[PDB]
């Protein structure tokens, strides 16, 4: 059953050079390559969201967690550890009228579906204790109905450790790129995102929503659930734009550097000269 739990705040931070991904599946080495497609511009103004569930409040005016626009593509980032972020929802109306794409990760698999979900206003996986040993996850608070399912995909899970994703929806394909990076402090430097899966779904996507997971709270082992344990999930969102990038491949074939041609005159000169 749908319940509103999440209060979301936002700040603004700098995407220095993150979001670069391999544009094709062709091996190149010791070469500079010029490409033109949807990239996250360097030093972009990305939004840092904090989704907070605090248990034991009063009133209902504090719950605000609306779905975000998809624009031309999304750069998603997180630095979470306790599996609080489980996946995503993509679609236009996020109800039974249209089709929507749901991605869920649970510790052994990723489930990707395209169905006419009647999503809840504040969807989240409900993790509850069974037999005082196991924890079971329910989708009854993610959607109320899933009908007319047209796509399904099961594989290994997608999800101090920064997790970066790039989602694009082009020519009937939902392309995902991923990277995991051990960090200490958005970092400096480069971490080229690698292709993950190309889903052949011809869906119209305008909005997306992050899917969390919440554990039920038990005051004592003899008591029932009194709600969900207080939680916090922080992530970063940026938006792709059509740009031309000069990517550098090293001897081993990895993308070690990039230049945003439209960023400023010096980078434009570098792109014109095809040199760094």
């Amino acid at each position, epitope marked *: *059953q*749908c*319940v*509103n*739990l999440i209060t979301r705040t936002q700040s603004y931070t700098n995407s220095f050079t993150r979001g670069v991904y391999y544009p094709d599946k062709v091996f190149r080495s010791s070469v500079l390559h010029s490409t033109q497609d949807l990239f996250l511009p360097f030093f972009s103004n990305v939004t840092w969201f904090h989704a907070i569930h605090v248990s034991g409040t*009063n*009133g*209902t005016k504090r*719950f605000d967690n609306p779905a975000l626009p998809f624009n031309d593509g999304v750069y998603f980032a997180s630095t979470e550890k306790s599996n609080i972020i489980r996946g995503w929802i993509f679609g236009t109306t996020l109800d039974s009228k249209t089709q929507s794409l749901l991605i869920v990760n649970n510790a052994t698999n990723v489930v990707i579906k395209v169905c006419e979900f009647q999503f809840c*206003n504040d969807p989240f996986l409900d993790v*509850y204790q*069974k037999n005082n040993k196991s924890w*079971m996850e*329910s989708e*009854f608070r993610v959607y*109320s*109905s899933a009908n007319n399912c047209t796509f399904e995909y099961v594989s290994q899970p997608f999800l101090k450790n920064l997790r970066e994703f790039v989602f694009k929806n082009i020519d009937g394909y939902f392309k995902i790129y991923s990277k995991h990076t051990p960090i200490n402090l958005l970092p400096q430097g480069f971490s080229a995102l690698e292709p993950l899966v190309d889903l052949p779904i011809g869906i119209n996507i305008t909005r997306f929503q992050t899917l969390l997971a919440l554990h039920r709270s038990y005051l004592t082992p*003899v*008591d*029932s*659930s009194s*709600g969900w344990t207080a939680g916090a999930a922080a992530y970063y969102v940026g938006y792709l734009q059509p740009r031309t990038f000069l990517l550098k491949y090293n001897e081993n074939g990895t993308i070690t550097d990039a230049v945003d041609c439209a960023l400023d005159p010096l980078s434009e000169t570098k792109c014109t000269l095809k040199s760094f």
Partner: antibody
Amino acid sequence: QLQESGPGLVKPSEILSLTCSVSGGSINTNMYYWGWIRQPPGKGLEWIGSIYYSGTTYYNPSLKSRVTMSVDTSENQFSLKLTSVTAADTSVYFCARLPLGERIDYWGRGTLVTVSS
Amino acid sequence: SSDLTQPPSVSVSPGQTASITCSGNKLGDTYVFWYQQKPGQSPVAVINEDNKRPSGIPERFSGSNSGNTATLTISGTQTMDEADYYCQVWDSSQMVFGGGTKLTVLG
């Protein structure tokens, strides 16, 4: 504390209307749903529907075309309407509060409605 | 879930143990709640979340849930335990009740 109110006699092919008033607490909470459960005399319990502070509703599929529930947070009330009633709708109706919308902790006293001409 | 099956009647001698069974597809994957209704009154929850007793319920009420079967066990059954017991589950978008079991105490 939950109290039901409404007519106890309804003509067939007319509208059954009930209202539950809540005291000692506020409907304006995210932790509870507010539902209706009916029981024919001598028979079992059947859940009619549940409503949320924001107006989100769940309905019994066998009555979804005839059931409509509304919520009034200012007055701490929630109401049920059932159209095109027949004798099969003669029963005792409880208004209940549903912790997390999955169980019942407090029931109403129950009001008996008879559908007859 | 989506279908709960209950025996219509269970008869037990005083002081013995009464077992009321609820059957459904993959009940072990969902919480089951037990309600007791005495004649002329409103139901009261005796068990929540398959094994939890709310406040005020005698310690002789116990619950279990495994596979496709949920069990409500009353130990040292007394005359006052003579009532109607219902199992309840929440499926995707509906609340499902059992048919109800009438507990009779012999002797």
